[PDB]
Amino acid sequence: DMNTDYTLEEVGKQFDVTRERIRQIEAKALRKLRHPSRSEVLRSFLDD
DNA sequence: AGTAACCAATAAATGGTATTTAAAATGCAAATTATCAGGCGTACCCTCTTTGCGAATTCGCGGCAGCGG
DNA sequence: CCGCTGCCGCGAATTCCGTTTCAGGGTACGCCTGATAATTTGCATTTTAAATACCATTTATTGGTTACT
Incomplete structure (x- = not known):
């Protein structure tokens, strides 16, 4: 959802x-x- | 041949808040080889000659042209 | 001297279908050189047998004895 991905170090120094x-x-x-409850819909994107 | 749930007690029941550990692994940018890609040069003498052969027997129509009173 | 010839332009139904994705030019050769495209190491970030440092609310063991087949 945000323009770029911030690496582990940046997340650590931030939070x-x-x-x-x-x-x-x-x-x-x-x-x-x-946990099987939450993943149910994501399984539909299984073949890809 | 044996009743208790009394009130303390025991730490074990967890799943949760972190600065560590350094080893690993994983990526990263150099050195260092192969091979590819350009440029130059060649000294007996040689001199319009090749083409298209026809986007192929259309036809009907229009009009912008040269000759002409 | 304002008439006619001759050039050159321009146009000609609709959908589907099918199919061989297919061939044809007839001219040299060997040097230096830089110019990439290959190949070789180290360093950043994960992930590290795990090891580690605190908070946590919920059984476990529990403190066993007073009644009693």
């Missing part, structure tokens, strides 16, 4: 300096969206 914390945030987000 919370910790680098591995961003890694844990992404891990938890992936874990949540892998």
Whole structure:
């Protein structure tokens, strides 16, 4: 939704300096969206 | 051959807030080889000559042209 | 001296369908040189067996005894 992607370092220095914390945030987000309830519609974009 | 839920207690039940760890891996921009792409030159003598052959027997119509009182 | 010939332009139904994606020019050669396009290393960011440093509310063990087949 935004023009460019900001790398891990920029996100860390903006929100919370910790680098591995961003890694844990992404891990938890992936874990949540892998929960079968939320992903149901996205499966329809399965073949691509 | 054995009743309790009394009131403390014990840490285990979690899933959540982070500065670390350095190793790895992953990308990144150099050096350093191959090969490709241009330029030049050639000294017996040689001199209009090749074409199109016909976007191919249309036809009907129009009009802008040269000759002419 | 304002008439007619002769040039050159311009135009000619509608949809589908089909099909061979296809061939034909007849002229040289060997140097230097720069000019890219290949190929070779290191450094940024992930991701790191995990290791690590605090908050957290919810069972677990629990403190066992007073009644009693």
